[model samples]
Target: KSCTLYVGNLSFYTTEEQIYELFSKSGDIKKIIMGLDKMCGFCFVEYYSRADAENAMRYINGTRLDDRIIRTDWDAG
Candidate 1:
């Protein structure tokens, strides 16, 4: 019942807590994986369901977080 997504263009100073908090605005967040990439920031966020993830995507995709606008897309992997 959980859906995972890829988040990119994250703020370097962004934290897992911040990501969870931000995504929670849309629905129940299951998990978040913040990766290390100086030039291109990326993270993985999991939600309770695909619907929840999709809903969050509507408000969160292309939105600014940690002072940086980000891009969100489904993780086909």
Candidate 2:
């Protein structure tokens, strides 16, 4: 439950390892947060460093994520 930024609208059907695989590729993950998903279903991702944080944001921030189109600064515009 500690890290950098937030991911939202991700269905609870989504599991931890799925993103662990995705996020780990970008950088070192400090940990993971699921309760971030309230009525909103946001997944909190905290990176060991900001460098990787931005990296992951660009890749998985939007475009799919099970059709959530979760906005960071904006969608894949």
Candidate 3:
């Protein structure tokens, strides 16, 4: 099974490609969407499988990136 993830606390300057590259380290990334608010940055990422997403969430949640700590989880919104 596959699941969508919500990536938050991103650097306002972070891009879709950067997000993909960052998350792809754990598993295959299916899609990425960077939310429009630059001041309160957020992104959405889809993984090929839920297991991969979980792996990423475990290691990636509260992880630091570009001087900011990121938050990751299964998106409920």
Q: Rate the local accuracy (lDDT) of all candidates.
A: 0.83, 0.65, 0.81
Residue 8, model 3, lDDT? 82
* Candidate whose lDDT is highest: 1
Cα shift from native, residue 72, model 3 (Å) = 0.9
Looking at model 2, which ten-residue stretch has the lowest summed lDDT? 68-77
**What would the TM-scores of all predictions be?**
0.85, 0.70, 0.84
Q: Write the per-residue lDDT of candidate 1 for residues 1-77, one digit (tens) a residue.
A: 43877899997788899998888988888888889331348898889789989987799998989778988888755
lDDT of 3 by residue, 4-47 (tens): 78788899888788787778888899888779432368888888
Better of 1 and 3 by lDDT: 1
Cα lDDT of model 2 by residue, 1-77, tens digit: 22376776676676677667767877988867675542356666778877788877777677555555654331111
Give the candidate number with the greatest TM-score. 1
- lDDT of candidate model 3 versus the reference: 0.81
Return the clash pairs for model 3, or none: none
Pitting candidate 2 against candidate 3, the one with the higher lDDT is 3
Native-referenced Cα lDDT, model 1: 0.83
